[PDB]
From Swiss-Prot, chains A, B:
Residues annotated with N-methylphenylalanine modification: 1
Protein name: Type IV narrow pilus major component PilA5
Location in the cell: Cell inner membrane; Cell outer membrane; Periplasm
Transmembrane segments: 1-21
Mutant lacking the gene: phenotype: Deletion mutants show a defect in twitching motility while DNA uptake seems not affected.
Disulfide linkage: none
Domain of life: Bacteria
Span covered, complete protein: 6 to 61 of 116
Species annotation: Thermus thermophilus (strain ATCC BAA-163 / DSM 7039 / HB27)
Function in brief: Plays an essential role in forming the main structure of the narrow T4P pili that participates in twitching motility.
Post-translational modification: Glycosylated.
Length: 56, 56
């Protein structure tokens, strides 16, 4: 590579770095809560259906 | 699904849970009492009709 091409590369690397980038976040607490809540809704419906099947 | 749609779902699940829901209740005692009472009325009438049939 010519020295000019390396100079251009040295410039552009410095500009394509110094972007923002997202953090990874452990969102499993929020997702676990929604899983527990959705499951609780399912248990209530499953119970209601069971009261008809059981006739009691 | 996009992360936005999952975020919206995580919100709405938490709100459609945390309703009230009725308990099932064993009301068979109250219903059994009414059955016994209605049957007792029927036995009295059946007896009265029988006193005419029997002529005694």
């Amino acid at each position: 590579f010519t020295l000019i091409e390396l100079a251009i590369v040295i410039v552009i690397i410095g500009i394509l770095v110094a972007i923002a980038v997202p953090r990874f976040v452990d969102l499993t607490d929020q997702a676990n809560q929604a899983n527990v809540d959705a499951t609780a809704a399912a248990v209530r419906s499953a119970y209601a259906i069971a009261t008809v099947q059981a006739k009691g």
